[PDB]
Ligand binder design. Structure first.
Ligand SMILES: *[C@@H]1O[C@H](CO)[C@@H](O[C@@H]2O[C@H](CO)[C@@H](O[C@@H]3O[C@H](CO)[C@@H](O)[C@H](O)[C@@H]3O)[C@H](O)[C@H]2NC(C)=O)[C@H](O)[C@H]1NC(C)=O
Ligand SMILES: OC[C@H]1O[C@@H](S[C@H]2[C@H](O)[C@@H](O)[C@H](S[C@H]3[C@H](O)[C@@H](O)[C@H](O)O[C@@H]3CO)O[C@@H]2CO)[C@H](O)[C@@H](O)[C@@H]1O
Ligand SMILES: OC[C@H]1O[C@@H](S[C@H]2[C@H](O)[C@@H](O)[C@H](S[C@H]3[C@H](O)[C@@H](O)[C@H](O)O[C@@H]3CO)O[C@@H]2CO)[C@H](O)[C@@H](O)[C@@H]1O
Ligand SMILES: *[C@@H]1O[C@H](CO)[C@@H](O)[C@H](O)[C@H]1NC(C)=O
Ligand SMILES: *[C@@H]1O[C@H](CO)[C@@H](O)[C@H](O)[C@H]1NC(C)=O
Ligand SMILES: [Mg+2]
Length: 434
């Protein structure tokens, strides 16, 4: 994709911190950038749209290459169009924004400068942030996560990609998404079928560390492995993931090794009025421990609320013990829940180690779920028809009829999430309390 010049692209500032082992932290002046899929995409010769609604202009985009040559991503009005505001240490994403047209959700990335994403290698480190999820009902997901996108957005080896990180280009994840307009320096118009989205012929695959997927009801922490940790391009249904007729037939792990406290048997721990009380802000700490060879072997979670350090809840499911993500936990959980262990298949902890070594980009998003209504995260039963008596079926308190986008984009139009006070450093460097 080309660089559009009709609207200035100014990345809202967002400060985040790097800490020493003793808890002394210094500030980094980062910026946030909106993902390319949300942008106006128009001809390089003026204001004519290359893409409108859920279809392409086939004169401008008769094929993937020509489309990338002809079409330019332009600047974004962050607050006015997309409901994205960044102030000091805080980033707020609004669910619905009624600008000139209705916008639903957003996906953003942390930048180190105006043409490069910040990358992270969190081995032997922790990532910590504050979050307010009180405004997120059933069916919403304020996600903060990491994927090994190219730091420059792909420009160095993609001749038809000039827009790059500056315009939020280069997304991939463990679902191998086919709804992306640009993948690996080409448009995705060939094979495009409308569902503001459709599915193109290609998907964009990589490993994915879901540090935080949550609303006020339920939260999940989920690493996803991949055969190749950085971006690869896939072919239609062979992509696997959510947009395929054969979910597990691809090169990534679309399920991950998840820890959702509620799914792991503790329904008293996370939620409204609960131990981690989602009616108020709280701190989320995620630690990436290694074995003696420096390979990831454990992900731990702590919360801080009202100055109290709260260890992650123990899994209470018979056959699945502990309160952290380890090889023993993941093996046990997949066996006991009867879920295909695509996590281990595509390289598990070694895959995630390699993803960190490649360098992870931080993604902050807010979305609703057109495939499964977020029921996998927060439903009394997922699948909806499954028995909550069966281990792994229940994930939250939301009804099986909750989270339908057409419903919640109305009833929860005022929803929002605020991420703040991002801190990174050695183990136990970023938090304290009683
Ligand atoms: C990205 O998606 C496109 C489809 O939009 C994939 O293109 C398809 O690629 C396969 C393999 O090259 C082609 O399959 C075959 O076609 C040839 C004849 O051209 C045939 O002799 C082979 O036996 C095979 O059946 C297919 O034609 C092609 N389709 C189109 C429309 O181009 C492409 O593979 C995807 N890229 C990646 C990296 O997965
Ligand atoms: O309508 C806003 C915007 O939508 C894109 S397509 C977009 C899709 O509508 C949306 O449901 C998903 S949400 C996505 C989330 O951002 C990500 O964090 C998570 O990992 O995966 C979720 C499901 O994919 O994102 C899609 C794009 O990636 C239209 O193209 C655009 O024109 C429109 O303005
Ligand atoms: O991350 C963006 C991506 O999210 C999926 S939701 C997806 C979720 O990431 C994944 O962890 C679970 S795996 C789930 C499995 O499907 C089910 O069979 C089993 O019983 O429980 C497992 C743990 O929940 O699947 C979720 C549904 O796909 C969005 O749908 C996708 O659009 C988006 O890109
Ligand atoms: C498609 O693009 C062509 C070339 O600029 C233009 O003539 C035509 O009006 C466009 N149509 C739509 C529907 O965008
Ligand atoms: C850090 O704090 C946790 C929680 O109190 C403690 O269990 C752990 O031993 C500490 N880790 C290190 C490396 O000091
Ligand atoms: Mg293509």
């Amino acid at each position: 994709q080309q660089i559009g010049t009709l609207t200035t692209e100014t990345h809202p500032p967002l400060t985040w911190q790097t800490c020493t082992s003793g808890g002394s932290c210094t500030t980094n002046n980062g910026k946030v950038v909106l993902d390319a899929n949300w942008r106006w995409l128009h001809s390089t010769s003026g204001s004519t749209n290359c893409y409108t609604g859920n279809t392409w202009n086939t004169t401008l985009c008769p094929d993937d290459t020509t489309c990338a040559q002809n079409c330019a991503l332009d600047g974004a009005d962050y607050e006015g169009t997309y409901g994205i505001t960044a102030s000091g240490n805080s980033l707020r994403l609004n669910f619905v924004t009624n600008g000139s047209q209705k916008n639903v959700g957003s996906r953003t990335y942390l930048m180190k400068d105006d043409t490069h994403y910040q990358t992270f290698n969190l081995l032997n480190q922790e990532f910590t942030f504050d979050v307010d999820v009180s405004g997120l009902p059933c069916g919403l997901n304020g996600a903060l996560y990491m994927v090994p996108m190219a730091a420059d957005g792909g420009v160095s080896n993609e001749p038809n990609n000039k827009a790059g990180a500056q315009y939020g280009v280069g997304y991939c994840d463990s679902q191998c998404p086919r709804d992306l307009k640009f993948i690996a320096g080409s448009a995705n118009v060939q094979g495009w079928e409308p569902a503001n989205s459709g599915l193109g012929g290609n998907g964009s695959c990589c490993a994915e560390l879901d540090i935080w997927e949550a609303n006020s009801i339920s939260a999940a922490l989920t690493p996803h492995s991949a055969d190749t940790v950085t971006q690869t391009v896939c072919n239609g249904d062979d992509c696997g993931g959510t947009y395929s007729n054969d979910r597990y037939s691809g090169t990534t792990d679309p399920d991950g090794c998840d820890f959702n406290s509620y799914r792991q048997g503790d329904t008293s721990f996370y939620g409204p009025g609960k131990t981690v009380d989602t009616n108020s802000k709280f701190t989320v700490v995620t630690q990436f421990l290694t074995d003696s060879s420096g390979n990831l072997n454990e992900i731990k979670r702590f919360y801080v609320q009202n100055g109290v350090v709260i260890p992650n809840s123990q899994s209470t499911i018979a056959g699945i013990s502990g309160n952290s993500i380890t090889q023993d936990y993941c093996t046990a959980q997949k066996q006991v829940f009867g879920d295909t262990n695509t996590w281990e298949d595509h390289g598990g902890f070694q895959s995630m180690t390699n993803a960190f070594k490649a360098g992870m980009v931080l993604v902050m998003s807010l979305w609703d779920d057109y495939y499964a209504d977020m029921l996998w995260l927060d439903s009394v039963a997922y699948p909806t028809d499954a028995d909550p008596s069966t281990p792994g079926v229940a994930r939250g308190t939301c009804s099986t009829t909750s989270g339908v986008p057409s419903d919640i984009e109305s009833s929860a139009a005022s929803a929002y999430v605020i991420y703040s006070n991002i801190k990174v450093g050695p183990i136990n460097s970023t938090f304290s309390g009683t």
